[PDB]
Write a protein that binds this ligand. Structure first.
Ligand SMILES: [Mg+2]
Ligand SMILES: [Mg+2]
Ligand SMILES: [Mg+2]
Ligand SMILES: [Mg+2]
Ligand SMILES: [Mg+2]
Ligand SMILES: [Mg+2]
Ligand SMILES: [Mg+2]
Ligand SMILES: [Mg+2]
Ligand SMILES: [Mg+2]
Ligand SMILES: [Mg+2]
Ligand SMILES: [Mg+2]
Ligand SMILES: [Mg+2]
Ligand SMILES: [Mg+2]
Ligand SMILES: [Mg+2]
Ligand SMILES: [Mg+2]
Ligand SMILES: [Mg+2]
Ligand SMILES: [Mg+2]
Ligand SMILES: [Mg+2]
Ligand SMILES: [Mg+2]
Ligand SMILES: [Mg+2]
Ligand SMILES: [Mg+2]
Ligand SMILES: [Mg+2]
Ligand SMILES: [Mg+2]
Ligand SMILES: [Mg+2]
Ligand SMILES: [Mg+2]
Ligand SMILES: [Mg+2]
Ligand SMILES: [Mg+2]
Ligand SMILES: [Mg+2]
Ligand SMILES: [Mg+2]
Ligand SMILES: [Mg+2]
Ligand SMILES: [Mg+2]
Ligand SMILES: [Mg+2]
Ligand SMILES: [Mg+2]
Ligand SMILES: [Mg+2]
Ligand SMILES: [Mg+2]
Ligand SMILES: [Mg+2]
Ligand SMILES: [Mg+2]
Ligand SMILES: [Mg+2]
Ligand SMILES: [Mg+2]
Ligand SMILES: [Mg+2]
Ligand SMILES: [Mg+2]
Ligand SMILES: [Mg+2]
Ligand SMILES: [Mg+2]
Ligand SMILES: [Mg+2]
Ligand SMILES: [Mg+2]
Ligand SMILES: [Mg+2]
Ligand SMILES: [Mg+2]
Ligand SMILES: [Mg+2]
Ligand SMILES: [Mg+2]
Ligand SMILES: [Mg+2]
Ligand SMILES: [Mg+2]
Ligand SMILES: [Mg+2]
Ligand SMILES: [Mg+2]
Ligand SMILES: [Mg+2]
Ligand SMILES: [Mg+2]
Ligand SMILES: [Mg+2]
Ligand SMILES: [Mg+2]
Ligand SMILES: [Mg+2]
Lengths: 240, 122, 339, 393, 46
RNA sequence: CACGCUUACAUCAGUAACUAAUAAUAUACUGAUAAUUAACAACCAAUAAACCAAAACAACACUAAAACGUUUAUUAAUUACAUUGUUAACCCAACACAGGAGUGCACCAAGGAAAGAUUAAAAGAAGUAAAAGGAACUCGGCAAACACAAACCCCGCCUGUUUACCAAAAACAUCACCUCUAGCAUUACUAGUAUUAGAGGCAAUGCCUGCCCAGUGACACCAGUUUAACGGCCGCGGUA
RNA sequence: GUUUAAAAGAACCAACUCAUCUAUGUGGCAAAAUAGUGAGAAGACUUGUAGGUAGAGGUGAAAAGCCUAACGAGCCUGGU
RNA sequence: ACCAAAGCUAGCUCAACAUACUAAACAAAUACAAAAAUACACCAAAAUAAAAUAAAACAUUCACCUAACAUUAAAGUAUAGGAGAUAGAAAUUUUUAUCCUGACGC
């Protein structure tokens, strides 16, 4: 039998929704990814990755929201933050020093003068200084922050040429995009996430990581320190 | 293993298997979870008056029987409508367009007890 | 072990007789002999009490704007339950100046009252224990609409050895034909509060009849003589459970049979009609080995059903009965003995 | 952006029509004549089924705009279970009132006066707490949904036991689940406190004004705190079908017209299902304001004017062990402007009746260290409760 | 440990795995029913 | 009680024979006749909005971030009595099998009987007791014991998993440490985004992990780089 | 239940779950059991119900284990 | 003397003819967990035959192998084949209607 996905929820809500885990099984029922299953029961907190999202289309100008609480999220390694502006609240990915009772700005205006970059602020890449640390960057204007989200990770703006911004990802790779792509400034919360120490083999099971197979496999040619050069810059601008 | 030849009734299943024994439904489920019974769905037994009815369950043994003559549509027509239509044609007022005066029904959906849909059980 | 589950508000045809058999209770029509030695205390305001009762009735029937009720049937439970609560509260607050025990009494609203006892033996008919003697067990899980619990016990109505020519009706049949059904769960003896409560005595119970046992429903079922049988059964079950819980909280049981009669009062109310009952538990030794030489019987005095109002309309009570109000006033003005 | 619908879970699109439906002037041969699907024949397209006779249960739900009460202007309704983000601040803004911490001087004197106490106050209230928390149920540890209303009724009875000393508390009555609806336009925003509360005490005689004229006049110089990023309508139900009519919980000619005290209960066994203290204070403030507005508009009229005779309402919110007391004096009816006189509200918050309760005796190292009973007891909370109850007489 | 009791009865699993609806919902189960009918089995399914 | 078996349950009558691994007779065979009565259980509203704030006596907290809900607005046929499960000594193991069986109550107030009748041979199984000695037995102190303690090594850090039915381990996994592979969207990974996710090696921690790209692989589409990639890290002769 | 500021993949030890060693049993109570003795026993724990992954496969804390009492690859039918 | 032994039937098998080929029953219930009267849908899918065997092995090959053209000859011929095992036509020819159907079948 074919199973249905738990992600059948069209309406965005702030309350946590229940999610049905599936350990490596596709919709058929066979294992696709090994080492997944049997974790802790978790709820899902829907995150709004399109930071610049006005409430009503009548006023599409920049807007300011207020941070209510920075909470823990079991789904991602970062911390979430509830931000309220107008008549709705939303979950975003909290920055390094975002605390309760702060103000965050969300703007899409680009000017000849660069703006002073705070942490919770989210301006397009064309309005930020040339050496700014950023996170939750976008690929296309209005697509959504697919890129940097993990705890403590952050990219850096390198240069802006011909109305196109170049950023550098945590993987030390260069990514060229339009300057109108919104991006949040600062580092993502939980910078000490890599320093955490799993105390025992049971914490991995709590997180939902089944043990590795006991089959001994001889290393092939893939193994070894492959010193490969940095790949070329990944560009997302469509040149006609 | 289990049995396959025996009938699969409601007594042979879990608590969540409650199959009826063949009775007809008499209502629906209301608001607070109770059952609302509809008085139009329950069969109303139409019983006649057997007080002055001079007829018994058995007949006289010396009474004679009759030859089997199963009543047919042609016989019924000859008994109920052939004299009327014959008299009407002899009088000269016969109307082939209107046959409702002789007992014919164009559409069954008008009356209460229709014949082809069989709205009445018995 | 297994036990019968006795329901006070039951649908059985003649359940008062079966409950009398289960309880060793004799039912007497009319009120018990009144203690005519009462001082000239009842100088209360009958007009004020009438206005208060009519105020509660009109508030719960016409004045209170509730949510839009789509069913036109206008069910009588949601209109009489708050009426009963408000009537009890108002009567207690008003008569607390005459009866000083009502001010110190506790008012429980829909609190369960449980009692579990044994009555006779029975040979096990089926099973691997066939032919062996097993005692019949009963359990009452009642939920009175309103209870008034006091600190001191109400005075007795008749002596403990009160002899009555009427005998307890015995049933030449099995209790399964009532119908009663056996079940097995926690057998608890509850008075309405735990034994650590200082108010271990009861004053008056209030029982609202459900919509399944209405006069119209019984008349449609062609059960007119059971309109009083349901009231009698509710009283005999509920008040016996209450007095038995009180006695077993005091420390009396089958082999430690009760020494002082445990009395209780009950008001059973339909959507419109009222009935008043008085119960006096004299004996708690209902078991087989303890009912051999036990001449004592429990007594239940009953009053026929009488309507309080009559077809009220548009914030005006058409008919009103003061005798039922006087009965309620006396029931709430009964006081314990002073020393 | 990121659409929240997954294609494999959304309603799948209808299959493409057969190729015989694209040929002009050609009738399709379908299986509609045999009343069943059959392969090889075209798929018949059927018009929307018309049940010529309508059925109540088995009909499609009529739209919202079809309703006769549908209006274009959005009304922000506050019902019983509406939560507020900036609770007290939002309530003060929406009701145009000034907040004070301590209870009014009248109720404080009525509390601190030792002549208004019950016979055995300490023992009576301790027994009430113990009965509510442990004794009222046959279980070992009763739930909040059972011990909150029980303790509220026990305190209500402890207060009612004072009618033999004050023969004036008989002018009151109780009401449960009465529909209240008070709508007002404030700063071009049409708000409406509409729903039902837990318990409502009504009385024949009104409550006297408790605020002094000096305080009422100094209220003019007080400005309401504003929150810039958040809108004052955060947490309210934005509806379009509503009735702008001052409908109180009762009809005309009610013998107990004046509301004395509202009672709110947070009887929920789950922390997320319960209300926060701030949200509970906001809820009780908004509902007391709705009751006061209903009474004022039934007494004087629907015209917006400053009331020469203020309307005093009381409210008590109970978590089971935490009590919030509120005395709200409504003085004005014009609420669109933020320049005139504002109402007043004294809110005594975080009043602990008892710190903790042990339903079972704790044993550490084979010895009982804390017996059964409430640990820590503040009789001042019940003193304020009794003051609020006796404030009418 | 001890074998032989591999059959734990349950009517839900029985009717869901070898029931008439389970057989008829697949073209292979229809072939099973047709084979049982050709052989003349008194019981085609559970 | 749930799940499961369906009358094996109850009354009367019979058992020469059939079932009980034998009789007596009978819950287990035979025949006739009866039975399980609903309050417990099953079936027993949708459409939008307000809703971040765990359960653990929950006061308040920890991490692994946690099932269990009300209110408001629109429609929910409206009128007694609907339908179904109610026995048992019972199920799965070829059996009236010393086996396998979920849950709530108590350790008896409920369940039952180790011996068909004798005698007291050997050998066998179980137990109790034993002078003096106290491992001298034996592969081994296996088993047993009025003992139920203290140390030294090997292998695995540890808890844990494995060959259902001859091997429970020094095997596997394991926290930790290292390599590679990926710059990304509507069914796994993941409603995640390089502090991330996969393919692997070795095994916590401490000191370290030395030399080698000659060959074979892998990146590089040829050079060139890679050994915490597959793997290898020298002869012959004389000398104080 | 006991020890612990601890619900610490801590300790003693019940229910419960496994099966270390020995002795019976070996057409046996049993196609894997009994008795004594053992290991875990707040967790990577046991377990009820229901569903999914099906043999050129599934699943596997690799024993080439398990997939309805015979699995280096199930069973049945057909080729036969 | 027990145990036992012997029947001749039930019926089957192979053909011919043949109407032209999913029998009878179908009151109600039957693809809800079949035999359960009664609610706003979804319904349907195809992609070569393989191998056991023979070639004394086994790799190209291996008649029949659930696809109509029957019969007498051409003819086991031309042809196709690790040119091995084996496979194998066609052009062209012959074929007189019905009953005489039962059984050196159990
Ligand atoms: Mg995760
Ligand atoms: Mg996290
Ligand atoms: Mg690994
Ligand atoms: Mg390994
Ligand atoms: Mg079978
Ligand atoms: Mg069933
Ligand atoms: Mg069952
Ligand atoms: Mg009914
Ligand atoms: Mg088997
Ligand atoms: Mg069986
Ligand atoms: Mg025998
Ligand atoms: Mg029998
Ligand atoms: Mg039974
Ligand atoms: Mg012997
Ligand atoms: Mg014996
Ligand atoms: Mg013997
Ligand atoms: Mg011997
Ligand atoms: Mg021996
Ligand atoms: Mg010994
Ligand atoms: Mg010795
Ligand atoms: Mg030796
Ligand atoms: Mg030796
Ligand atoms: Mg030993
Ligand atoms: Mg030793
Ligand atoms: Mg020793
Ligand atoms: Mg180990
Ligand atoms: Mg260690
Ligand atoms: Mg495993
Ligand atoms: Mg083994
Ligand atoms: Mg094992
Ligand atoms: Mg072993
Ligand atoms: Mg081991
Ligand atoms: Mg290892
Ligand atoms: Mg290191
Ligand atoms: Mg190794
Ligand atoms: Mg090491
Ligand atoms: Mg090395
Ligand atoms: Mg190389
Ligand atoms: Mg090289
Ligand atoms: Mg442990
Ligand atoms: Mg054992
Ligand atoms: Mg021994
Ligand atoms: Mg043991
Ligand atoms: Mg142990
Ligand atoms: Mg240990
Ligand atoms: Mg399954
Ligand atoms: Mg092969
Ligand atoms: Mg495989
Ligand atoms: Mg191996
Ligand atoms: Mg091997
Ligand atoms: Mg097998
Ligand atoms: Mg060959
Ligand atoms: Mg050969
Ligand atoms: Mg060979
Ligand atoms: Mg061969
Ligand atoms: Mg072939
Ligand atoms: Mg050739
Ligand atoms: Mg050859």
């Amino acid at each position: 039998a074919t199973s249905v996905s738990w992600k059948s929820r069209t309406k965005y809500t702030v309350m946590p929704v229940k999610m049905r885990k599936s350990g490596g099984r596709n919709h058929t029922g066979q294992i696709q990814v090994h080492g997944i299953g049997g974790g802790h029961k978790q709820r899902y907190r829907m995150i709004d990755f399109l930071r610049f999202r006005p409430e009503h289309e009548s006023k599409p100008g920049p807007f300011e929201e207020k941070v209510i609480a920075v909470r823990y999220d079991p789904c991602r390694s970062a911390d979430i933050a509830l931000v309220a502006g107008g008549n709705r609240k939303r979950w975003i990915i909290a920055t390094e020093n975002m605390k309760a009772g702060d103000t965050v700005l969300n703007s899409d205006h680009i000017g000849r003068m660069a703006v002073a970059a705070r942490e919770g602020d989210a301006h397009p890449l064309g309005a930020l200084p040339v050496g700014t640390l950023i996170n939750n960057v976008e690929s296309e204007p209005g697509r959504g922050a697919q890129y940097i989200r993990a705890a403590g990770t952050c990219g850096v703006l390198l240069r802006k040429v011909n109305g196109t911004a170049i950023i550098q990802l945590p993987s030390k790779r260069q990514m060229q995009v339009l300057e109108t792509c919104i991006a949040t400034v600062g580092r993502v919360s939980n910078v000490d996430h890599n320093k955490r120490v799993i105390g025992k083999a049971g914490r991995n099971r709590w997180l939902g990581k089944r043990p590795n197979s006991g089959l001994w496999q001889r290393k092939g040619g893939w193994a070894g320190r492959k010193i490969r050069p940095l790949p070329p810059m990944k560009s997302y601008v469509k040149l006609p | 293993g289990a049995d396959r030849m025996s009938k699969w009734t409601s007594k042979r299943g879990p608590r969540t298997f409650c199959k009826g024994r063949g009775a007809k439904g008499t209502g629906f489920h209301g608001r607070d979870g109770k059952f609302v019974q509809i008085k139009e769905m329950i069969p109303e037994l139409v019983v006649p008056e057997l007080a002055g009815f001079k007829l018994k369950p058995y007949v006289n043994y010396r009474a004679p029987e009759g030859t089997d003559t199963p009543l047919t549509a042609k016989q019924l027509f000859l008994e109920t409508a052939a004299p009327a239509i014959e008299k009407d044609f002899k009088a000269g007022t016969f109307d082939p367009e209107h046959l409702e005066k002789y007992g014919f029904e164009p559409t069954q959906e008008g009356k209460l007890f229709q014949l082809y849909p069989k709205n009445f059980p018995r | 072990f297994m036990k019968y589950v006795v329901y006070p508000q039951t649908f059985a045809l003649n359940a008062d007789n079966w409950y009398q058999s289960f309880t060793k209770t004799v039912f007497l029509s009319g009120l018990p002999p009144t203690p005519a030695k009462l001082e000239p205390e009842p100088t209360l305001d009958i007009t004020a009490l009438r206005e208060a009762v009519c105020d509660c009735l009109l508030q719960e029937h016409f004045f209170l704007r509730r949510k839009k009720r789509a069913p036109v049937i206008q069910d009588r439970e949601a209109i009489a339950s708050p009426f009963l609560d408000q009537l009890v509260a108002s009567l207690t607050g008003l008569l607390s100046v005459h009866n000083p025990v009502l001010a110190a009494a506790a008012l429980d609203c829909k609190r369960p009252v449980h009692f579990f006892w044994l009555r006779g033996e029975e040979i096990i008919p089926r099973g691997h224990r066939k032919g062996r003697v097993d005692a019949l067990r009963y359990q009452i899980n009642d939920k009175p609409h309103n209870q008034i619990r006091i600190s001191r016990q109400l005075p007795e109505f008749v002596p403990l050895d009160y002899s009555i020519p009427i005998e307890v009706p015995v049933m030449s049949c099995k209790p399964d034909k009532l119908p009663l059904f056996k079940r097995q769960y926690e057998n608890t003896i509850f008075i309405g509060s735990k034994t650590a409560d200082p108010l271990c005595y009861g004053h008056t119970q209030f029982h609202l009849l459900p919509d399944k046992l209405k006069r119209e429903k019984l008349l449609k079922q062609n059960c007119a003589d059971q309109i009083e049988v349901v009231f009698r059964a509710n009283a005999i079950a509920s008040l016996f459970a209450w007095t038995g819980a009180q006695a077993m909280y005091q420390g009396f049981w089958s082999e430690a049979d009760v020494t002082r009669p445990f009395v209780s009062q009950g008001v059973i109310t339909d959507g419109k009609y009222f009935s008043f009952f008085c119960y006096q538990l004299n004996t708690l030794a209902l078991t087989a080995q303890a009912d051999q030489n036990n001449p004592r019987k429990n007594i239940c005095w009953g009053t026929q059903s009488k309507p309080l109002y009559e077809t009220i309309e548009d914030n005006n009570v058409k008919g009103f009965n003061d005798d039922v109000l006087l009965q309620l006033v006396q029931f709430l003005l009964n006081r314990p003995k002073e020393d | 952006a990121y659409e929240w619908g997954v294609r494999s879970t959304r309603k799948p699109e209808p299959p493409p029509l057969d190729r015989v439906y694209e040929i002009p002037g050609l009738e399709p041969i379908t299986y509609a004549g045999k009343m069943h699907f059959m392969p090889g024949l075209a798929r018949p397209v059927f018009p929307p089924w018309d049940p010529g006779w309508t059925h109540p249960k088995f009909r499609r739900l009529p739209p919202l705009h079809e309703h006769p009460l549908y209006k274009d202007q959005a009304c922000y309704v506050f019902h019983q279970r509406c939560r507020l983000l900036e609770g007290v601040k939002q309530a003060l803004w929406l009701t145009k009132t000034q907040l004070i911490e301590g209870l009014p001087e009248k109720v404080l004197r009525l509390a601190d006066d030792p002549r208004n106490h019950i016979e055995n106050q300490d023992e009576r209230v301790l027994n009430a707490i113990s009965h509510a928390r442990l004794w009222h149920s046959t279980e070992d540890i009763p739930k909040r949904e059972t011990y909150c209303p029980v303790i509220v009724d026990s305190l209500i009875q402890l207060c009612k036991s004072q009618i033999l000393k004050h023969p004036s508390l008989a002018r009151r009555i109780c009401a449960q689940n009465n529909t209240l609806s008070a709508t007002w336009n404030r700063e071009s925003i049409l708000l409406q406190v509409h729903g039902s509360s837990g318990a409502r005490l009504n009385a024949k005689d009104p409550l006297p004004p408790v605020a002094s004229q000096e305080e009422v006049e100094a209220t003019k110089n007080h400005v309401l705190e504003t929150f810039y990023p958040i809108s004052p309508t955060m947490g309210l139900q934005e509806c379009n079908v509503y009735d702008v009519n001052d409908d109180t919980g009762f009809q005309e000619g009610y013998p107990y017209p004046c509301p004395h005290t509202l009672y709110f209960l947070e009887s929920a066994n789950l922390r997320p299902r319960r209300f926060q203290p701030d949200q509970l204070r906001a809820k009780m403030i908004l509902f007391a304001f709705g009751s006061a507005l209903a009474q004022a508009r039934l007494l004087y009229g629907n015209d917006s004017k400053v009331l020469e005779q203020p309307v005093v309402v009381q409210s008590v919110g109970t978590d089971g062990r935490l009590f919030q007391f509120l005395v709200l004096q409504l003085n004005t009816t014009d609420l669109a402007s933020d320049e005139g006189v504002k109402n007043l509200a004294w809110v005594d918050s975080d009043q602990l009746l008892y710190q903790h309760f042990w339903c079972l005796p704790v044993i550490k190292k084979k010895v009982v260290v804390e017996p059964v009973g409430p640990i820590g007891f503040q009789p001042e909370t019940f003193r304020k409760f009794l003051a609020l109850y006796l404030h009418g007489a | 440990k001890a074998r032989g009791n591999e059959y734990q009865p349950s009517n839900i699993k029985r009717k869901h795995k070898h029931g008439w609806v389970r057989r008829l919902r697949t073209p292979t189960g229809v072939q099973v029913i047709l084979r049982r009918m050709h052989k003349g089995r008194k019981s085609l399914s559970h």
